[PDB]
A paper describes a structure:
Second, a construct of the pleckstrin homology (PH) domain of the TFIIH subunit p62 from [name] (p62 PH), encompassing the first 109 residues.
For treatment with [name] only during SEC (crystal #2), a low anomalous peak was observed at site 4. Compared to p62 PH without [name] treatment (crystal #1) the anomalous peak at this site is higher for dataset #2. Thus this site was modelled as potassium in dataset #1 and a Cs in dataset#2 and the following datasets. The first two datasets that could not be phased experimentally show no or only a very small anomalous signal (RCR anomalous).
Author numbering: -6 to 108
Write the structure that this text describes.
Amino acid sequence: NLYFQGAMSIPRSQTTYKKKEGILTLTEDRKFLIWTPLPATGPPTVSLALDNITNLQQTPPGSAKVILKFTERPRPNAEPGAPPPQYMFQFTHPTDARAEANAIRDLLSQLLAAA
Ligand SMILES: [Cl-]
Ligand SMILES: [Cl-]
Ligand SMILES: [Cl-]
Ligand SMILES: [Cs+]
Ligand SMILES: [K+]
C-alpha cells in the first residue's frame, strides 16, 4: 500500500508569453504554474492554479515553434458560447526548447493526474 509522490526537480524554462521573454516554472508547493517576465525579480504575471487547468496541448515536434498551451476552467460569469481561458508559452532555449517543454509537460500531467 505504498504511496509515492513525484520527485523530479521543478524546471525554470525560458519562455515567451504574449511576445515578452520570461521564465515558466511552478511554485515550490507545486500548486501553481507561474510565468514571470525577465528579469524575473518581480512577481508572476501569470499564476494558474493546477486545480483550474483542464487541458494541456503542445505543438507537434517539427513545428516552427515549440509551444505548450494550457486551458483553464471557464470563469464564473463567462457566456456559454465563449472560449475558455488559454495561455500559450513558447519555449525559446535555442537547443533545449523541445526537451524543456517535454519536462514541464510531463511534470504538469503527473500533478494534474495526482489531484
Ligand atoms: Cl514558491
Ligand atoms: Cl532568471
Ligand atoms: Cl520540435
Ligand atoms: Cs531549464
Ligand atoms: K519563431
